[PDB]
Coordinates of C-alpha atoms in Angstrom, one line a residue:
Chain A
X1052 CA 0.0 0.0 0.0
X1053 CA 2.7 2.5 0.8
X1054 CA 4.5 2.0 -2.5
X1055 CA 1.2 2.4 -4.4
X1056 CA 0.3 5.5 -2.5
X1057 CA 3.8 7.0 -3.2
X1058 CA 3.5 6.2 -7.0
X1059 CA 0.1 7.8 -7.2
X1060 CA 1.8 11.1 -6.0
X1061 CA 4.2 11.3 -8.9
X1062 CA 3.3 14.3 -11.2
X1063 CA 5.6 13.9 -14.2
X1064 CA 3.8 10.7 -15.3
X1065 CA 0.8 8.4 -14.7
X1066 CA 0.7 4.6 -14.1
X1067 CA -1.7 1.8 -15.0
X1068 CA -0.8 -0.9 -12.4
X1069 CA -3.5 -3.5 -13.2
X1070 CA -4.3 -5.8 -10.3
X1071 CA -6.5 -3.3 -8.3
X1072 CA -3.6 -0.9 -8.5
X1073 CA -3.6 2.4 -10.3
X1074 CA -5.9 3.9 -13.0
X1075 CA -5.4 7.1 -14.9
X1076 CA -8.1 9.8 -15.2
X1077 CA -8.4 12.3 -18.0
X1078 CA -10.3 15.6 -18.2
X1079 CA -11.8 16.2 -21.6
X1080 CA -12.1 19.8 -22.9
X1081 CA -15.8 19.4 -23.8
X1082 CA -16.7 23.1 -23.0
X1083 CA -14.0 24.4 -25.4
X1084 CA -15.2 22.1 -28.2
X1085 CA -18.8 23.1 -27.6
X1086 CA -17.8 26.8 -27.9
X1087 CA -15.3 26.8 -30.8
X1088 CA -16.9 24.1 -33.1
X1089 CA -20.6 25.0 -32.9
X1090 CA -22.2 24.7 -36.3
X1091 CA -19.6 22.1 -37.5
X1092 CA -20.0 18.5 -38.3
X1093 CA -17.5 16.5 -36.3
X1094 CA -15.8 13.9 -38.5
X1095 CA -13.2 12.6 -35.9
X1096 CA -12.1 13.2 -32.3
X1097 CA -8.8 11.5 -31.6
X1098 CA -7.3 10.9 -28.1
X1099 CA -3.9 9.2 -27.7
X1100 CA -2.1 7.9 -24.6
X1101 CA 1.6 7.1 -25.0
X1102 CA 4.2 5.5 -22.8
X1103 CA 7.8 5.0 -21.8
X1104 CA 9.6 1.7 -22.3
Chain B
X1491 CA -21.8 11.8 -67.2
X1492 CA -23.3 10.4 -70.4
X1493 CA -24.1 13.8 -72.1
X1494 CA -22.0 16.5 -70.5
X1495 CA -18.9 17.4 -68.5
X1496 CA -19.5 21.2 -68.4
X1497 CA -19.4 22.4 -64.8
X1498 CA -22.1 25.0 -65.7
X1499 CA -24.5 22.0 -65.2
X1500 CA -24.3 22.4 -61.4
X1501 CA -26.9 25.1 -61.8
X1502 CA -30.6 24.7 -62.8
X1503 CA -31.8 21.6 -64.6
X1504 CA -28.4 21.4 -66.3
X1505 CA -28.2 22.5 -69.9
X1506 CA -31.2 22.0 -72.2
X1507 CA -30.7 19.5 -75.0
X1508 CA -32.0 20.6 -78.4
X1509 CA -34.1 17.7 -79.7
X1510 CA -32.9 18.7 -83.2
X1511 CA -33.0 15.7 -85.6
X1512 CA -30.5 14.9 -88.3
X1513 CA -31.4 17.6 -90.9
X1514 CA -31.9 20.4 -88.3
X1515 CA -28.7 19.5 -86.4
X1516 CA -26.6 20.3 -89.5
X1517 CA -28.9 23.3 -90.5
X1518 CA -28.2 25.2 -87.2
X1519 CA -31.4 24.0 -85.6
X1520 CA -34.0 25.8 -87.8
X1521 CA -36.8 23.5 -86.9
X1522 CA -39.9 25.7 -86.5
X1523 CA -40.6 26.4 -90.2
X1524 CA -39.3 23.2 -91.7
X1525 CA -41.5 20.8 -93.7
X1526 CA -38.9 18.4 -95.0
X1527 CA -41.1 15.4 -95.5
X1528 CA -38.4 12.7 -95.7
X1529 CA -37.3 13.1 -92.0
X1530 CA -39.0 13.5 -88.7
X1531 CA -39.4 16.8 -86.8
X1532 CA -40.8 16.8 -83.3
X1533 CA -40.0 20.5 -82.6
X1534 CA -43.1 21.7 -84.4
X1535 CA -46.1 19.3 -84.3
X1536 CA -47.7 20.9 -87.4
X1537 CA -44.8 19.4 -89.5
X1538 CA -46.2 15.8 -89.3
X1539 CA -48.7 16.3 -92.2
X1540 CA -45.9 16.3 -94.9
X1541 CA -45.3 12.5 -94.8
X1542 CA -45.8 10.5 -98.0
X1543 CA -48.9 8.3 -98.1
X1544 CA -47.7 4.7 -97.7
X1545 CA -44.5 5.4 -95.6
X1546 CA -43.4 4.7 -92.1
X1547 CA -40.3 6.6 -90.8
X1548 CA -38.2 5.4 -87.8
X1549 CA -35.4 7.9 -86.9
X1550 CA -32.6 7.5 -84.3
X1551 CA -29.2 9.1 -83.5
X1552 CA -25.8 9.1 -81.7
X1553 CA -23.2 11.8 -81.2
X1554 CA -19.5 12.0 -80.1
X1555 CA -17.9 15.1 -78.5
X1556 CA -14.6 16.5 -77.3
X1557 CA -14.8 19.5 -74.9
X1558 CA -11.7 21.7 -74.5
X1559 CA -12.2 23.3 -71.1
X1560 CA -10.1 26.4 -70.1
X1561 CA -9.9 28.8 -67.1
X1562 CA -7.5 30.6 -64.9
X1563 CA -4.5 29.4 -66.9
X1564 CA -5.4 25.7 -66.6
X1565 CA -6.3 23.8 -69.8
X1566 CA -7.8 20.3 -70.1
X1567 CA -10.2 18.4 -72.4
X1568 CA -12.8 15.7 -71.9
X1569 CA -14.7 13.3 -74.3
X1570 CA -18.1 11.8 -73.9
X1571 CA -20.8 10.4 -76.2
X1572 CA -24.6 10.5 -76.2
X1573 CA -28.0 9.2 -77.5
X1574 CA -30.1 12.1 -78.8
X1575 CA -33.4 10.9 -80.2
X1576 CA -35.6 8.0 -81.3
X1577 CA -39.0 8.5 -82.9
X1578 CA -41.7 6.8 -85.1
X1579 CA -44.0 8.6 -87.5
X1580 CA -46.9 7.4 -89.7
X1581 CA -50.0 8.7 -91.5
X1582 CA -53.6 8.0 -90.4
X1583 CA -55.6 9.8 -93.0
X1584 CA -55.2 12.0 -96.2
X1585 CA -55.2 14.9 -93.7
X1586 CA -53.7 13.6 -90.4
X1587 CA -50.4 12.1 -89.2
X1588 CA -49.2 10.8 -85.8
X1589 CA -45.8 10.3 -84.2
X1590 CA -44.5 8.7 -80.9
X1591 CA -40.9 9.1 -79.7
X1592 CA -38.4 9.5 -76.9
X1593 CA -36.4 12.6 -76.3
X1594 CA -34.0 14.2 -73.8
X1595 CA -34.8 17.6 -72.2
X1596 CA -31.8 18.4 -70.1
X1597 CA -28.7 16.6 -68.7
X1598 CA -26.2 17.2 -66.0
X1599 CA -22.6 15.9 -65.7
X1600 CA -19.7 17.2 -63.7
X1601 CA -17.0 15.9 -61.5
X1602 CA -14.8 18.7 -60.1
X1603 CA -12.4 17.7 -57.4
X1604 CA -9.6 19.3 -55.3
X1605 CA -6.7 18.4 -53.0
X1606 CA -5.3 20.6 -50.2
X1607 CA -3.1 20.8 -47.1
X1608 CA -3.5 23.0 -44.1
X1609 CA -0.6 24.9 -42.3
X1610 CA -1.0 22.5 -39.4
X1611 CA -0.1 19.6 -41.7
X1612 CA -3.5 18.0 -42.3
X1613 CA -4.2 17.0 -45.9
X1614 CA -7.7 17.0 -47.1
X1615 CA -9.6 16.5 -50.4
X1616 CA -13.0 17.6 -51.7
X1617 CA -15.1 16.2 -54.5
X1618 CA -18.2 17.8 -56.1
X1619 CA -20.1 15.5 -58.5
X1620 CA -23.5 15.4 -60.3
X1621 CA -25.5 13.0 -62.3
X1622 CA -28.9 12.5 -64.0
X1623 CA -31.3 14.7 -66.0
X1624 CA -34.8 15.2 -67.3
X1625 CA -36.4 13.2 -70.1
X1626 CA -39.5 13.3 -72.3
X1627 CA -41.6 10.7 -74.0
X1628 CA -44.4 12.0 -76.3
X1629 CA -47.3 11.2 -78.5
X1630 CA -48.3 13.8 -81.0
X1631 CA -50.6 14.4 -83.9
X1632 CA -51.0 17.0 -86.7
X1633 CA -54.0 17.8 -88.9
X1634 CA -54.8 19.9 -92.0
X1635 CA -57.6 22.4 -91.3
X1636 CA -57.2 24.2 -94.7
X1637 CA -55.2 23.4 -97.8
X1638 CA -52.4 25.8 -96.7
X1639 CA -52.6 25.4 -92.9
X1640 CA -51.7 22.7 -90.4
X1641 CA -51.9 22.5 -86.6
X1642 CA -50.8 19.9 -84.1
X1643 CA -50.0 19.1 -80.5
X1644 CA -47.5 17.0 -78.4
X1645 CA -48.6 15.5 -75.1
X1646 CA -45.6 14.2 -73.2
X1647 CA -44.7 12.3 -70.0
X1648 CA -42.0 14.3 -68.4
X1649 CA -39.8 12.6 -65.7
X1650 CA -36.2 12.7 -64.4
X1651 CA -33.8 12.7 -61.5
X1652 CA -31.0 15.2 -60.8
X1653 CA -28.4 14.3 -58.1
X1654 CA -25.6 16.6 -56.8
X1655 CA -23.1 15.7 -54.1
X1656 CA -20.4 17.4 -51.9
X1657 CA -17.6 15.5 -50.1
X1658 CA -14.8 16.0 -47.6
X1659 CA -12.2 13.3 -47.4
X1660 CA -8.9 13.0 -45.5
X1661 CA -6.4 10.8 -47.4
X1662 CA -3.8 9.2 -45.2
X1663 CA -5.8 9.4 -42.0
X1664 CA -6.1 6.1 -40.2
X1665 CA -9.7 6.2 -39.2
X1666 CA -12.3 8.9 -39.7
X1667 CA -15.8 9.7 -40.9
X1668 CA -16.4 11.3 -44.3
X1669 CA -19.0 14.0 -44.8
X1670 CA -21.2 14.0 -47.9
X1671 CA -24.5 15.7 -48.7
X1672 CA -26.5 14.4 -51.6
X1673 CA -29.4 16.6 -52.7
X1674 CA -31.7 14.8 -55.1
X1675 CA -34.8 16.0 -57.1
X1676 CA -37.1 13.4 -58.7
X1677 CA -39.7 14.8 -61.1
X1678 CA -42.7 13.1 -62.7
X1679 CA -45.4 15.2 -64.5
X1680 CA -46.7 16.0 -68.0
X1681 CA -45.9 18.6 -70.6
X1682 CA -48.0 20.1 -73.5
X1683 CA -46.6 21.6 -76.7
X1684 CA -48.6 23.4 -79.5
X1685 CA -47.7 24.4 -83.0
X1686 CA -48.9 25.6 -86.4
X1687 CA -47.6 26.0 -89.9
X1688 CA -48.7 27.8 -93.1
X1689 CA -47.3 27.4 -96.6
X1690 CA -47.5 29.9 -99.5
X1691 CA -47.1 29.2 -103.2
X1692 CA -44.7 31.9 -104.4
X1693 CA -43.9 32.3 -108.1
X1694 CA -45.3 28.8 -109.2
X1695 CA -42.0 26.9 -108.4
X1696 CA -40.9 28.3 -105.0
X1697 CA -42.7 28.1 -101.7
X1698 CA -42.4 29.9 -98.4
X1699 CA -43.4 28.5 -95.1
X1700 CA -43.9 30.2 -91.7
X1701 CA -44.2 28.3 -88.4
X1702 CA -44.8 29.1 -84.8
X1703 CA -44.7 27.0 -81.6
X1704 CA -45.8 27.5 -78.0
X1705 CA -45.9 25.7 -74.6
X1706 CA -47.5 27.1 -71.5
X1707 CA -46.0 27.8 -68.0
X1708 CA -46.3 24.7 -65.7
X1709 CA -45.7 23.6 -62.1
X1710 CA -44.2 20.2 -61.5
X1711 CA -44.9 17.3 -59.2
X1712 CA -41.6 16.4 -57.5
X1713 CA -39.8 14.7 -54.6
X1714 CA -37.0 17.0 -53.5
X1715 CA -34.9 15.5 -50.7
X1716 CA -31.8 16.6 -48.7
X1717 CA -29.7 13.6 -47.7
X1718 CA -26.5 13.9 -45.6
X1719 CA -24.3 10.8 -45.4
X1720 CA -21.9 10.3 -42.6
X1721 CA -19.1 7.7 -42.2
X1722 CA -19.4 5.9 -45.5
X1723 CA -16.2 4.1 -46.7
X1724 CA -15.0 1.4 -49.1
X1725 CA -16.5 -1.2 -46.7
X1726 CA -19.4 0.5 -45.0
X1727 CA -22.6 2.4 -46.0
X1728 CA -22.5 4.9 -43.1
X1729 CA -25.7 6.5 -41.9
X1730 CA -28.2 8.6 -43.9
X1731 CA -30.0 11.5 -42.2
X1732 CA -32.7 12.1 -44.8
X1733 CA -34.8 15.2 -45.0
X1734 CA -37.9 15.7 -47.2
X1735 CA -38.8 19.2 -48.4
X1736 CA -41.8 21.0 -50.0
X1737 CA -40.0 22.5 -53.0
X1738 CA -41.7 24.0 -56.0
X1739 CA -40.4 23.5 -59.6
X1740 CA -41.7 25.0 -62.8
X1741 CA -41.4 25.3 -66.6
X1742 CA -41.7 28.7 -68.3
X1743 CA -43.7 30.0 -71.2
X1744 CA -41.9 29.3 -74.4
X1745 CA -42.3 31.0 -77.8
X1746 CA -40.7 30.3 -81.2
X1747 CA -41.1 31.5 -84.7
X1748 CA -39.4 31.1 -88.1
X1749 CA -39.6 30.7 -91.8
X1750 CA -38.2 28.6 -94.6
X1751 CA -37.9 29.5 -98.3
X1752 CA -37.8 26.7 -100.9
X1753 CA -37.0 26.7 -104.6
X1754 CA -37.5 24.0 -107.3
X1755 CA -37.1 21.4 -104.6
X1756 CA -33.4 21.9 -105.0
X1757 CA -32.7 24.7 -102.4
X1758 CA -34.1 25.7 -98.9
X1759 CA -33.0 28.5 -96.6
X1760 CA -34.5 29.6 -93.3
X1761 CA -34.1 31.2 -89.9
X1762 CA -35.6 30.8 -86.4
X1763 CA -36.0 32.8 -83.2
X1764 CA -37.2 31.5 -79.8
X1765 CA -37.5 32.9 -76.2
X1766 CA -38.1 31.1 -73.0
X1767 CA -39.5 33.1 -70.0
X1768 CA -37.2 31.6 -67.3
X1769 CA -36.9 34.8 -65.3
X1770 CA -40.7 34.8 -64.7
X1771 CA -40.7 31.5 -62.8
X1772 CA -41.3 31.1 -59.0
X1773 CA -38.8 28.5 -57.9
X1774 CA -38.5 28.1 -54.1
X1775 CA -38.4 25.8 -51.1
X1776 CA -39.6 26.2 -47.5
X1777 CA -37.5 24.9 -44.6
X1778 CA -36.2 25.8 -41.2
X1779 CA -32.6 25.2 -42.2
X1780 CA -31.0 28.3 -43.8
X1781 CA -28.0 26.4 -45.3
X1782 CA -30.4 24.3 -47.4
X1783 CA -32.6 27.2 -48.3
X1784 CA -29.7 29.3 -49.5
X1785 CA -28.4 26.4 -51.7
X1786 CA -31.8 26.0 -53.3
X1787 CA -32.1 29.7 -53.9
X1788 CA -28.6 29.9 -55.4
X1789 CA -28.7 26.7 -57.5
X1790 CA -32.2 27.1 -59.0
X1791 CA -32.2 30.6 -60.4
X1792 CA -32.5 31.6 -64.0
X1793 CA -32.5 34.2 -66.8
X1794 CA -34.4 34.4 -70.0
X1795 CA -32.9 32.1 -72.7
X1796 CA -33.0 33.3 -76.3
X1797 CA -31.8 31.5 -79.5
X1798 CA -31.2 32.8 -83.0
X1799 CA -30.3 30.4 -85.8
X1800 CA -30.0 30.3 -89.6
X1801 CA -29.3 27.4 -92.1
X1802 CA -29.8 26.0 -95.5
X1803 CA -29.5 22.8 -97.6
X1804 CA -28.9 22.3 -101.3
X1805 CA -29.5 19.2 -103.5
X1806 CA -28.0 19.6 -107.0
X1807 CA -29.4 17.9 -110.1
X1808 CA -30.9 14.9 -108.3
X1809 CA -31.8 13.1 -111.5
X1810 CA -28.3 12.8 -113.0
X1811 CA -26.3 9.6 -112.7
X1812 CA -23.7 10.6 -110.2
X1813 CA -23.9 9.9 -106.4
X1814 CA -22.7 13.4 -105.5
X1815 CA -25.8 14.7 -107.2
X1816 CA -28.0 12.8 -104.7
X1817 CA -26.2 14.0 -101.5
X1818 CA -28.0 16.7 -99.5
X1819 CA -25.5 19.5 -98.5
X1820 CA -26.2 21.4 -95.3
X1821 CA -24.9 24.4 -93.4
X1822 CA -25.9 26.6 -90.5
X1823 CA -24.9 28.8 -87.5
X1824 CA -26.6 29.9 -84.3
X1825 CA -26.4 32.1 -81.3
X1826 CA -27.7 31.6 -77.7
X1827 CA -27.7 33.3 -74.4
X1828 CA -27.9 30.4 -71.9
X1829 CA -30.2 30.7 -68.9
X1830 CA -27.4 30.5 -66.3
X1831 CA -27.3 33.2 -63.5
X1832 CA -24.2 32.9 -61.4
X1833 CA -23.7 35.5 -58.7
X1834 CA -26.3 38.2 -59.6
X1835 CA -25.1 38.5 -63.2
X1836 CA -25.6 36.4 -66.3
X1837 CA -23.1 33.7 -66.8
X1838 CA -22.2 32.8 -70.4
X1839 CA -22.8 33.4 -74.1
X1840 CA -22.3 30.8 -76.8
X1841 CA -21.8 30.6 -80.6
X1842 CA -22.0 27.7 -83.1
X1843 CA -21.3 26.8 -86.7
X1844 CA -22.6 23.5 -88.2
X1845 CA -22.2 21.5 -91.4
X1846 CA -23.3 18.1 -92.6
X1847 CA -24.6 15.8 -95.4
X1848 CA -27.7 13.8 -96.4
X1849 CA -26.3 10.5 -97.8
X1850 CA -29.2 8.5 -99.4
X1851 CA -29.2 4.7 -99.7
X1852 CA -29.7 3.6 -103.3
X1853 CA -32.8 1.6 -104.1
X1854 CA -34.3 2.8 -100.9
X1855 CA -35.6 6.0 -99.3
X1856 CA -33.5 5.7 -96.1
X1857 CA -31.1 8.6 -95.3
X1858 CA -27.9 8.7 -93.3
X1859 CA -27.3 12.1 -91.9
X1860 CA -23.6 12.5 -90.8
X1861 CA -23.2 16.0 -89.4
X1862 CA -20.7 18.0 -87.3
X1863 CA -20.8 21.1 -85.1
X1864 CA -18.3 23.5 -83.5
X1865 CA -19.6 25.4 -80.5
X1866 CA -17.8 28.0 -78.3
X1867 CA -19.1 29.0 -74.8
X1868 CA -17.5 32.2 -73.4
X1869 CA -17.8 33.1 -69.8
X1870 CA -18.8 36.7 -69.2
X1871 CA -17.0 37.1 -65.8
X1872 CA -13.4 36.5 -64.9
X1873 CA -13.9 33.6 -62.5
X1874 CA -15.7 31.3 -65.0
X1875 CA -14.6 28.8 -67.6
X1876 CA -14.5 28.9 -71.4
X1877 CA -15.4 25.9 -73.6
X1878 CA -14.5 24.9 -77.1
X1879 CA -16.7 21.7 -78.0
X1880 CA -16.6 19.7 -81.2
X1881 CA -19.1 16.9 -82.1
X1882 CA -19.9 14.5 -85.0
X1883 CA -23.5 13.2 -85.2
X1884 CA -24.7 10.0 -86.9
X1885 CA -28.4 9.4 -87.6
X1886 CA -30.5 7.2 -89.9
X1887 CA -34.1 7.8 -91.1
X1888 CA -35.3 4.3 -91.9
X1889 CA -38.2 4.5 -94.4
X1890 CA -40.1 1.6 -95.8
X1891 CA -43.4 1.0 -97.8
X1892 CA -45.6 0.0 -94.9
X1893 CA -49.4 0.5 -95.2
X1894 CA -49.8 -1.0 -98.7
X1895 CA -52.8 -3.1 -99.6
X1896 CA -53.9 -5.0 -102.7

């Protein structure tokens, strides 16, 4: 538990430790899309997560 | 894309096809005053009464073309081929004749594409296409009310489908949804056409004819629809968000008049004039969506079309034994202001010169009517294209002794 709680507090990166460990949470900019692209047809919205070795 | 590639056809019903048969196509289209009894003429119903007693005439036609298209320093050319008419004609009485046939009215064809790249690095491609047209199938009759005077009518079924698309594609992107809006207009109604002709016996050998033709203003049954497709691909159909609209379509009042002089059955000359009241038509659509409304009001808008044409044919010494004495020689030229309104101003202005032959089959009365036409369309404003179009035109008036009895 202490190691998991310590790794949750790192701020340069996020982890994905699977067996009931760590998830990562993302905040989408829905309000900005709703303001800037009103009247458009959305053809694609792409989100990418990428990792270290 | 079976009759045109001119990108002017993105406006209106396309460009109107002249249902000018073999003799008129070489003679500049002077079809109102003509009474050439060996070939069919649907453009003026009063012309049917000239047919010989025992005959049945079956005319058809093809045409090839090469459009040189130019604008903004770019030059390109495009080649299509068509089917321009098919019609039967026969006599019912010493004073009445009837015909039935199949004719084009207007056609559309254009593909105009584009490829781009934004400053952010995204490449994208657009594609604006169009297809279809309006067609006409008719039954008509003409009668002699006096020894000099004939009148007639054409009653026609009048149907078609014009489809016009806009696309937005992103080549190289892994997975995305393409946007395409396909506005379609199906039409199915009827059309009436009226005509009369009068012939005068000048100087005992010549004859002079005058003809007029008229068709009334009309409002068309239709099925206008505004489809937007989303997510279609090489593997999937996407989704279609259809939208059905209460659009109004019309045909204008049309007037035409002309004459033909004739001498010793060796020479004929004539000239025609016609005007179509397109600017006095109430096209429109009702909807809550301004984008659609603006498109309709900018794509279906017109100006008055007028046409001026002159032509002649000459048949020298048709009883002498030499085949070039049996060949009908034809010439003509014409001028038109097309009905296109682009921006607020009128779009184009066109000129044409025509020539052709009248090759007869020996030991028969069939005629092969090879003809050719050069036409130039000039854009009247700097942002529009110019066209130089060339076209051969094969057509055969079959003719056989049909209603004979012992």
